[PDB]
Amino acid sequence: PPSFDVTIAPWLIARSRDVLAAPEMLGLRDVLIRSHELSDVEIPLPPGAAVLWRILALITARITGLDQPPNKNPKRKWQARRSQILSKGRLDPEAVDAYFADYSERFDLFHPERPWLQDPRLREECPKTSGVNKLAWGRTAGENQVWLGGHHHDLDPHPLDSAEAVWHLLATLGYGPSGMCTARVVRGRSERNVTAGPLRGTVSYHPLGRTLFESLILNIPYPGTGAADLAFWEQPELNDPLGLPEESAGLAGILRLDH
RNA sequence: AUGGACCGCCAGUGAUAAGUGGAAUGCCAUGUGGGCUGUCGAGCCCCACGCACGUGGGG
Hints:
This protein is mainly α. Helix content is about 30%, strand content about 5%. Helix 2 (about 45-65) crosses helix 7 (about 160-175). The chain starts with 11 loop residues before the first strand and ends in a 5-residue tail after the last helix. The structure holds one RNA strand. It comes from Thermobifida fusca (strain YX). This is CRISPR-associated protein, Cse1 family. The PDB classes it as immune system.
């Protein structure tokens, strides 16, 4: 069976502190563990990186951010723990595996159920596949002309590398076109219309440092005190199309990652 | 065979109609161009003649 894991499979290009020659691609778990070692991890698509730094800020960061500044001058104490871990200069791998451990079997995007940032049921109710060309950026869609980025005629399209596929999926989850995508029925409801992505047409500002760990630490908005939150992949069960997108005072609702 | 290769910004259009630059006005007043002065022997060749002093013909 096909399987890919963000934690173990290599997709994230990584640059080391030394030499600055031959960046190697690594998984998400490895980057997390070897963070002080690497200066940065890079994605060729700025949309892909714009959502990427958002999700990476919810993993390493969440564990370090703690999701809980109650009493004690909240802002002051989070900045105190912040100074404490910033002083350590690194994250203990055992707390990473523990986080990964909670949902270790839930990451491999190609999951039959619970695929990464995806809806698995979707396959059954949509008659026409959008196609890779409609998903991937710089790639021509059905109505798009054949002039740029290699010519894709939408007949025998060359498949995206799985690592490549991951970058695109993440971008479309951030930036995404609005109106007239392919309709899927849900108990009688068919509406090809689609609204735009949450950050669409914007510049995301991520502070950097000398090493990875620094940036990841300095990348988390301070979560105000509020309801405990979780991510789309931290959701216990699927949302369903109908109904209200519930609010989320937690930072996962402030990383625009609740839904 | 280079964020490249292939690749039109493009189809249309009066700036028009009207109009004295016009009225007046001396560049005026003065001045030698002067002295000197007669127009009176190489020249390259051919030929003819010669009293070899020199004559003439032709180019």
